[PDB]
Amino acid sequence: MEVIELNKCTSGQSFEVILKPPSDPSLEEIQKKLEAAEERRKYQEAELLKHLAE
Amino acid sequence: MREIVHIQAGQCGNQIGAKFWEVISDEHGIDPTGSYHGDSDLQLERINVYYNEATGNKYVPRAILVDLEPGTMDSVRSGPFGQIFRPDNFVFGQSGAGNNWAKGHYTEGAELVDSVLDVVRKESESCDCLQGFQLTHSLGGGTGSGMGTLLISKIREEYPDRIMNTFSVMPSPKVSDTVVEPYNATLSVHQLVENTDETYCIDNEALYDICFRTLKLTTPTYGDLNHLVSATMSGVTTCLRFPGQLNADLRKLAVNMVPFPRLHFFMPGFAPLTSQYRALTVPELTQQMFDSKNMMAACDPRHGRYLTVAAIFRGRMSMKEVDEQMLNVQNKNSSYFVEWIPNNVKTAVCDIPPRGLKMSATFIGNSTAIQELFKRISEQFTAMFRRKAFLHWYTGEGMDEMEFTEAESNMNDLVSEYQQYQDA
Amino acid sequence: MRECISIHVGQAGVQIGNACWELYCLEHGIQPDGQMPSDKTIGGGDDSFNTFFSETGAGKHVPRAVFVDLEPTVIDEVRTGTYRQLFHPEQLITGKEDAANNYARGHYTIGKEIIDLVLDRIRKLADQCTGLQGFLVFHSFGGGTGSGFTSLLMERLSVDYGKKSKLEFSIYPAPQVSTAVVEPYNSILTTHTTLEHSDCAFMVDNEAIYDICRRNLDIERPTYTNLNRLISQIVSSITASLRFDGALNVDLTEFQTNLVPYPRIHFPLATYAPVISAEKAYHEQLSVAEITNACFEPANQMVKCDPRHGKYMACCLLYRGDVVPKDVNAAIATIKTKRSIQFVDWCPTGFKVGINYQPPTVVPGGDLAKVQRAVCMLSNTTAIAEAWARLDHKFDLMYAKRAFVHWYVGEGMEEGEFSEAREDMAALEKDYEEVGV
Amino acid sequence: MYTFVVRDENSSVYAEVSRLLLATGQWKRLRKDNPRFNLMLGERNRLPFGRLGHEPGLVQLVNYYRGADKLCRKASLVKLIKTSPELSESCTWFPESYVIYPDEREVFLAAYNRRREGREGNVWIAKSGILISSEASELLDFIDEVHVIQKYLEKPLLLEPGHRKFDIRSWVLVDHLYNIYLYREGVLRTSSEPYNSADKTCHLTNHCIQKEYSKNYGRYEEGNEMFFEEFNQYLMDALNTTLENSILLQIKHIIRSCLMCIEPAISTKHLHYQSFQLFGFDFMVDEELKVWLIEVNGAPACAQKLYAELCQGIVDVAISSVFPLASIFIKLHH
Numbered sequence A: 001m002e003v004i005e006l007n008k009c010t011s012g013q014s015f016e017v018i019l020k021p022p023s024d025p026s027l028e029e030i031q032k033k034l035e036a037a038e039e040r041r042k043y044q045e046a047e048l049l050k051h052l053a054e
Numbered sequence B: 001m002r003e004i005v006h007i008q009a010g011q012c013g014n015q016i017g018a019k020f021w022e023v024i025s026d027e028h029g030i031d032p033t034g035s036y037h038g039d040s041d042l043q044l045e046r047i048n049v050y051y052n053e054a055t056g057n058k059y060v061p062r063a064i065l066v067d068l069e070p071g072t073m074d075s076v077r078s079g080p081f082g083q084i085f086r087p088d089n090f091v092f093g094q095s096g097a098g099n100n101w102a103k104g105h106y107t108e109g110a111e112l113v114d115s116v117l118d119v120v121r122k123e124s125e126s127c128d129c130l131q132g133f134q135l136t137h138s139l140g141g142g143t144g145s146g147m148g149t150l151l152i153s154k155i156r157e158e159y160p161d162r163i164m165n166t167f168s169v170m171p172s173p174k175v176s177d178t179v180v181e182p183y184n185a186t187l188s189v190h191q192l193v194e195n196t197d198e199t200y201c202i203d204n205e206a207l208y209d210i211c212f213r214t215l216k217l218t219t220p221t222y223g224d225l226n227h228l229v230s231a232t233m234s235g236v237t238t239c240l241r242f243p244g245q246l247n248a249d250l251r252k253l254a255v256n257m258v259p260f261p262r263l264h265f266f267m268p269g270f271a272p273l274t275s276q277y278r279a280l281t282v283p284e285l286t287q288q289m290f291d292s293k294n295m296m297a298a299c300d301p302r303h304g305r306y307l308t309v310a311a312i313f314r315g316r317m318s319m320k321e322v323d324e325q326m327l328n329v330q331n332k333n334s335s336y337f338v339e340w341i342p343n344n345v346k347t348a349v350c351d352i353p354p355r356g357l358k359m360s361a362t363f364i365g366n367s368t369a370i371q372e373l374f375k376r377i378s379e380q381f382t383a384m385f386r387r388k389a390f391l392h393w394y395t396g397e398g399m400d401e402m403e404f405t406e407a408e409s410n411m412n413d414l415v416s417e418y419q420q421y422q423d424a
Numbered sequence C: 001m002r003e004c005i006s007i008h009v010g011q012a013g014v015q016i017g018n019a020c021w022e023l024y025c026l027e028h029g030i031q032p033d034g035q036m037p038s039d040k041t042i043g044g045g046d047d048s049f050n051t052f053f054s055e056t057g058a059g060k061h062v063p064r065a066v067f068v069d070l071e072p073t074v075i076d077e078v079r080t081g082t083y084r085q086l087f088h089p090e091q092l093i094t095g096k097e098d099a100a101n102n103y104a105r106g107h108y109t110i111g112k113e114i115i116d117l118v119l120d121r122i123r124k125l126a127d128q129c130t131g132l133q134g135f136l137v138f139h140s141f142g143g144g145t146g147s148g149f150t151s152l153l154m155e156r157l158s159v160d161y162g163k164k165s166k167l168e169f170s171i172y173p174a175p176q177v178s179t180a181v182v183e184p185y186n187s188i189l190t191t192h193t194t195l196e197h198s199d200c201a202f203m204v205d206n207e208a209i210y211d212i213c214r215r216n217l218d219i220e221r222p223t224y225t226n227l228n229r230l231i232s233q234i235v236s237s238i239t240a241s242l243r244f245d246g247a248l249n250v251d252l253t254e255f256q257t258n259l260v261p262y263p264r265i266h267f268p269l270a271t272y273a274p275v276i277s278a279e280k281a282y283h284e285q286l287s288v289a290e291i292t293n294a295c296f297e298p299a300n301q302m303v304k305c306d307p308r309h310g311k312y313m314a315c316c317l318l319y320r321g322d323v324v325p326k327d328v329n330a331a332i333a334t335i336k337t338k339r340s341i342q343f344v345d346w347c348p349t350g351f352k353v354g355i356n357y358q359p360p361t362v363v364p365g366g367d368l369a370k371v372q373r374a375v376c377m378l379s380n381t382t383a384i385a386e387a388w389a390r391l392d393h394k395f396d397l398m399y400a401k402r403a404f405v406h407w408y409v410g411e412g413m414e415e416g417e418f419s420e421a422r423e424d425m426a427a428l429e430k431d432y433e434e435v436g437v
Numbered sequence D: 001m002y003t004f005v006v007r008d009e010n011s012s013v014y015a016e017v018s019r020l021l022l023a024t025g026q027w028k029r030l031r032k033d034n035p036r037f038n039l040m041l042g043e044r045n046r047l048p049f050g051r052l053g054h055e056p057g058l059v060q061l062v063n064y065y066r067g068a069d070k071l072c073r074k075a076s077l078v079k080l081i082k083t084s085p086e087l088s089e090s091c092t093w094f095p096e097s098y099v100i101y102p103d104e105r106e107v108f109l110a111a112y113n114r115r116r117e118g119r120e121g122n123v124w125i126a127k128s129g130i131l132i133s134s135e136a137s138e139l140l141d142f143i144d145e146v147h148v149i150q151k152y153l154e155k156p157l158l159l160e161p162g163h164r165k166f167d168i169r170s171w172v173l174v175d176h177l178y179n180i181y182l183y184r185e186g187v188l189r190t191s192s193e194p195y196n197s198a199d200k201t202c203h204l205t206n207h208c209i210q211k212e213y214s215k216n217y218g219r220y221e222e223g224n225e226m227f228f229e230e231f232n233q234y235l236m237d238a239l240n241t242t243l244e245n246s247i248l249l250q251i252k253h254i255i256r257s258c259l260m261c262i263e264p265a266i267s268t269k270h271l272h273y274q275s276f277q278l279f280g281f282d283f284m285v286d287e288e289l290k291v292w293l294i295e296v297n298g299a300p301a302c303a304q305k306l307y308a309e310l311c312q313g314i315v316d317v318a319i320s321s322v323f324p325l326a327s328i329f330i331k332l333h334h
């Protein structure tokens, strides 16, 4: 094995042991998604109220 | 505060609704005058779901009593807990509905519906967070069936984003008032298919059979039938009236129980049904709860498949043993649960048992076998409609035969829709 | 010093955050009223614990935390709990009606009305940071808020804090405690939307915690309080490097450097030992070798899976208590010759070790016993893809019949987001199998 | 009432096991995609091990060991025997093999040229379509048209009368406790053609090849299958020894060695689900009564006469040991 990068302090210590070597959308686009879904809710509710009006 | 607004319409709707408020007022420690006299804070923790708090720390049921004649509502006001209801919430006419869906829906009920909605609006305006509505009614009469569904339609228009929940009593020739009940029930079922989120199918056929075969009551009355309804209504609302994680409100219940919007008709079950001092074990609760003889819909669950199941255990018992027995029933009879909805059985436990029992269990099933109920109504409908028998009671109120034909087709489609998922 | 802001979303995120911040106070000696006598720099300082706590003039140590829930009942517990004085009302955001276990309701309908308020409250805490390094987001997969509102928050945080790291602590759904049938839907929907926005996510399967509580703590029917105390121990050992002096995992960026060589594959497996019942009067204290060997037993993992039939990309051993480097290496040498530990060929076969001399703190009156030494292993193994395979299979069963889909479409969500999210998971499973086979 | 699912219809072994479980009246068969099972008789390819052991209130058991393909593939077995120190390349009961991709070509040639120069037996065999040739160029050209080339046992023990070749199939069952059970009944799949060390019919003892190309199929024994009672009597009459001493000790040693090697990689001792598996070991015996391992089969078929006894033994020690209701094996201890 091999122990590398030994760092010590009062509260503890850390090290690394090696055994073998190797071999975003914008706010505008987000707002469009949120309002598109709200538009589909309004359309679905308007059709319900239309159905109830008949 | 997630409030529910309760509405009871017609003779059956008010008689079972009155007993429901008597049963749950006793569970929450409310007396016939509205004063609280319990000994557990669990009684008051979710009290505002069904009760408004008035002056002097009085608890007033958030209930609205509707009928087209004053007879049954006068009996309620004269009943034990009659004084607890808000007097303004008594909305009644004088003509009646003659067991006629058209009178309740189109003529006599149309004259009274707006004043009912004024009271619904008054109750809803003070709600900090309204869940939705709870309607008790029968489908075989005229007021509860015809005016009840008119109310459901006008409430949905004014509150489209609220849950609509009903307790709907299905007619049976075993407990029949008039021959036109299949007409009234068929017209009402299509309304429920479109305008409710959850409907508990309470079959007077099943209530009669339970009273006769099981409870050994040779001559069952409506009081005997309504005792089964009271205990069932208490059980299915336990998760709404006490603190808990599962199905604690009307919408979360709907999301767990309704995989397809039109298939929202539930088979309720209850255990025990004793004709009384013997201790009932958790295994016995589970076996009886799932037994067809304890179902309130007169459908054989082994003739269909369970889409979703909600189970509620009440009393001081081992939740470990409850989990084991619930898993036992699923793993024992996994052929009766659809394999394309994983973990579709949910279990809740409440520490407070109902009155008179140390332990109880309530079953809420969305089974495709409920098509047997709708087939039965459909066959009784068609036997008369093919001869246009008794139609003049309805055409005399403005209805056309086409509206009956459309109602016939609507319920046959519902039957076909249940059958498609029973073989999928 | 660089501050970290913790965000707790939904019931599971809030209640777990409440358990963690309780443990942080006990570990750092912070009293419920916010006072910390051991802190000599009154009303300020750039110590290691200040990454998680700000300081008022009166000496109160305030968590850098925000709690968000669409229903007020759970956060009201924090408003009146034991540590109610730690937080000011601006840190606690509640709504009226929750997302009803509906991802679309949490993301589109209800989340749209509160997302700007939450970001404003996060901006208040960020303005108190001299060098904010990022966020730790606590949430469930299955809830409507924990899944739906989180993915919306993670999208906006990438916009407002593009250079900041974001780490997740995620509760994977388990039927033994789940409360909704559609939790597989919400899990796939929230993983698809959050994947590009999360740099490192620690998944906790409620099934694994439930059985550890039953088997190792002798709890018959574990509650959320039992589960959350154990989860907070794992979270504490993961974040101890940010709150204490040390040289391993000293900032959030080092978590990705040490554990996530491939961005989409950012779900390390956590294993914790020992879990001892406080009901046992005397218990044989386990050695360094015994607790390290326990890190390769599936019975101790946060997700039940078989690392022997996958490949490793990284491994961190985080020790707390009486542990010296000599015994760690002796334990690793013995384990390598007995266990099946295969790394990918483009990664070194090795372990990064961190030791903190302070042994784990137990909540007084809890279920966990005090131990002389404990260890949390963080291993990025392809075997954790078994969790995605289980989840995607349940998704496929329900979605083939469009069961419950109308609840999501009714909230404005389109049906195409279901299949798009499922295709992303299909690509995720393919990535794991390419690396690990 | 236990439950089980069937996901491999081409399995003659577990078709009988499924029939036996239903005959007990205490096992109910579910649909193949029903997750609420106790026992999975799984498929051969891509068995979803990751979905096992996640059903609350259900002890789940599967009839395959995840990772046992490392032992049941040609290239995997060769790599496992060489790389594992528990077996080592100095392993004496495994023919000198090499993995060739259409890689160990330079090592296979370093040994081939050493044999041609060494004036010793230089006949090899390639397989994964089998070619037996003493010319390495004909073997390497055949692969390009993953394989392994191992030393062909040029001096096999030949049965008389007939002067013919054979191989020994042993059935081994490993239960959830990793107990290794050797079925007391094996079969000798014999060639019915006289061995000519100068045709691929007297050299290949496969049951399908002897039934399609061999002219003397069934002449000496029925179905070119000699069982252990006859083979033990022959060894006593012809060589003055027993099947136990001359062969079975080596067979039990090889079986134990192979399965102990992979035990830490495939054991389900501390796993959320349990595994058992039936293996088919294939051995060769040379003229000096030395046993050589040829191949381990992960989904083997059984002999017709032995289907009844072996499948009942699977139910007894592998299924009913986990799911009790209301010896034909030799336990190889370790």
Ligand SMILES: Nc1nc2c(ncn2[C@@H]2O[C@H](COP(=O)(O)OP(=O)(O)OP(=O)(O)O)[C@@H](O)[C@H]2O)c(=O)[nH]1
Pocket (backbone or CB within 6 Å): C009, C010, C011, C012, C013, C015, C016, C069, C070, C098, C099, C100, C101, C102, C106, C140, C141, C142, C143, C144, C145, C146, C147, C171, C172, C173, C174, C177, C178, C179, C183, C206, C224, C227, C228, C231
């Ligand atoms: N470990 C743990 N899991 C929890 C806890 N609370 C809820 N869960 C799990 O989280 C999932 C449900 O998500 P919740 O957090 O309760 O729902 P939510 O985020 O509040 O969103 P809503 O649907 O709007 O209520 C289920 O799988 C629960 O088992 C908790 O305190 N600890």
Ligand SMILES: Nc1ncnc2c1ncn2[C@@H]1O[C@H](COP(=O)(O)OP(=O)(O)CP(=O)(O)O)[C@@H](O)[C@H]1O
Pocket (backbone or CB within 6 Å): D095, D125, D127, D150, D151, D152, D153, D154, D166, D167, D203, D204, D205, D206, D282, D284, D294, D295, D297
């Ligand atoms: N190294 C070797 N030396 C001599 N003969 C050999 C040999 N390898 C194989 N054979 C002969 O050739 C036959 C084919 O070997 P192999 O093990 O590849 O069969 P197979 O895998 O196709 C069917 P099964 O799965 O039942 O074993 C063997 O039965 C054996 O008789």
Ligand SMILES: Nc1nc2c(ncn2[C@@H]2O[C@H](COP(=O)(O)OP(=O)(O)O)[C@@H](O)[C@H]2O)c(=O)[nH]1
Pocket (backbone or CB within 6 Å): B009, B010, B011, B012, B013, B015, B016, B097, B098, B099, B100, B138, B139, B140, B141, B142, B143, B144, B145, B169, B170, B171, B172, B175, B176, B177, B181, B204, B207, B222, B223, B225, B226, B229
């Ligand atoms: N279970 C039950 N069913 C009833 C009761 N009263 C009436 N019914 C049923 O309801 C139908 C008659 O409807 P009813 O409520 O009397 O008519 P309405 O007053 O116009 O709504 C018939 O099918 C009866 O069997 C009752 O108290 N309990």
Ligand SMILES: [Ca+2]
Pocket (backbone or CB within 6 Å): B111
């Ligand atoms: Ca009039």
Ligand SMILES: [Ca+2]
Pocket (backbone or CB within 6 Å): B114, B115, B118
């Ligand atoms: Ca008016």
Ligand SMILES: [Ca+2]
Pocket (backbone or CB within 6 Å): C039, C040, C041, C042, C043, C044, C045, C055
């Ligand atoms: Ca300070």
Ligand SMILES: [Ca+2]
Pocket (backbone or CB within 6 Å): A024, C158, C162, C196, C197
């Ligand atoms: Ca980013």
Ligand SMILES: [Mg+2]
Pocket (backbone or CB within 6 Å): B011, B012, B141, B177
């Ligand atoms: Mg009447």
Ligand SMILES: [Mg+2]
Pocket (backbone or CB within 6 Å): C010, C011, C071, C098, C143, C145
């Ligand atoms: Mg919630």
Ligand SMILES: [Mg+2]
Pocket (backbone or CB within 6 Å): C162, C163, C164, C165, C166, C199
């Ligand atoms: Mg970044």
Ligand SMILES: [Mg+2]
Pocket (backbone or CB within 6 Å): D295, D297
């Ligand atoms: Mg083969």
